[PDB]
Amino acid sequence: SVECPFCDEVSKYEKLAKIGGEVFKARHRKTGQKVALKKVLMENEKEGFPITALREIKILQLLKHENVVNLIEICRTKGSIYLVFDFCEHDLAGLLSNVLVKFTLSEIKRVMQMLLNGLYYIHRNKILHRDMKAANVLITRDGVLKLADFGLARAFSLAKNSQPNRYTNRVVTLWYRPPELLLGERDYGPPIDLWGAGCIMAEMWTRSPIMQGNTEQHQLALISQLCGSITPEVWPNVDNYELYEKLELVKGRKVKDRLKAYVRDPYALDLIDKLLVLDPAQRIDSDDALNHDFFWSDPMPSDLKGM
Amino acid sequence: NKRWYFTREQLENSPSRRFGVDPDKELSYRQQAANLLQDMGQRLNVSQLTINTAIVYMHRFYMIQSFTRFPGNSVAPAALFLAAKVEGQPKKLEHVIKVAHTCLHPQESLPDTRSEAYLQQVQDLVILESIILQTLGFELTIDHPHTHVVKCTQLVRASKDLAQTSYFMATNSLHLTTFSLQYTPPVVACVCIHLACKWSNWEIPVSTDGKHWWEYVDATVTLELLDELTHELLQILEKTPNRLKRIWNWR
Lengths: 307, 251
Known about the structure:
The complex is a heterodimer of chains A (about 300) and B (about 250).
Chain A: E1 13-18, E2 23-28, E3 34-39, H1 51-62, E4 71-76, E5 81-86, E6 90-91, H2 92-97, H3 105-124, E7 127-128, E8 137-139, E9 145-147, E10 154-155, H4 179-182, H5 191-206, H6 216-227, H7 255-259, H8 266-275, H9 286-291
Antiparallel strand pairs in A: 1-2, 2-3, 3-5, 4-5, 6-8, 7-10, 8-9
Chain B: H1 8-12, H2 23-44, H3 48-61, H4 72-86, H5 93-104, H6 116-135, H7 145-154, H8 160-176, H9 185-199, H10 223-238
Helix pairs in contact in B: 2-3, 2-4, 2-5, 3-4, 4-5, 4-6, 7-8, 7-9, 8-9, 9-10
């Protein structure tokens, strides 16, 4: 037996149920405190401990914020490893799909405010989440929103000294994946996360992912039927991409028009329009979005506890 | 935040001491692990930062475990494999194992990469990496004095020379001492700049106020401490053959 002061055995927790990629809900055996246990998958891993897990851990250990999921500790098994997180009862997908659930404008304001605040926080810390979707947005029993699942997140940098960034391009789920990525961009930044937020905002009313593509080409056509067509006029330098016309695009902004039915409030629609902006550099950022008159109107943001 | 910092008394009663290893012997075991890490690290073509990270992993690992139980020659390669993954310069498992083998046994020749023996040492490495991760409680993000050196040198408008010598002091401070287990990286960085100034016969002008330069780097630092730690570091440097030669002005 070897000494192990700083990695407790997961036996301190009692496994209750697969809520998830193996995710278990569990209960601390002494305090009753609820947690989520995420086991580290070693399917093959012919290179010791998975570098991606090292990465995710480094990032979770960095990010400590009210609207970001909280890694409590790492547990061993005596061999496997489990990431232990503060437990969250609900997740946005489960709520947006359950018809027995209804948001007022005020609580929706509240949701979007916590979400944009989480993004602002992770970006201020030089992290890209890269997996924006409703199912990665958690909500605790007391109505606090938390961003989860950083297994696809990545640190970024101030890419100067004339050497553009070479980040991975096949990142973020298709329905939430921003235009930049679909054209093969590798020098992208925080705006990719902001784009998905757009899709989710609309999802608060459509109760369903606004843009569901078969393939990437289907995603781009579908995206175009809402946001207009790509053009060096709308998006200066768009030309620069090797897949511009080489991808059989359609020359052809019904964005505010197609959603008027679901989302009633003008400011909300304006904000969604400023999130779902084609040119990433012209796309609203988390700071200005939090500032949008949408959060500063009569139906002010309200807690969710109630519901 | 004070989990991996120790008092001199904590350093005296290390796990290795408790198994009959002299202070001096244990210190020697540490210097040898750092030497092996540097050799392997150079051959694998990782950065000094990665070697350094692996060295801190090692230093901390031996505040929890005993050398009588875990030999430097086993822990070093795993620590380096891990540090290379963590610092974004991943080296293949077989690769680190091959280089480890040539460093430890220059005259032997690699086993059949098909043998039960080789398969077992690959599995031993993976196992040791898991043990290291668990001893460190998966706390893998390490801060080095070098970061603070860069910043501070500029903050005294030092010659390129002086800056080069300061980084050299920092790296040797990792190989030769347990400063990383006792003092924060910014403090160590002050120690290194201080020794570098004395060694280069450089003098940092008293600030316009009457505030010393180091006061802009870490508030807890005092001249008494600086002189004590530079004397300690300098003493071990004098015991290391050819080491000072590298920074000795030969003109």
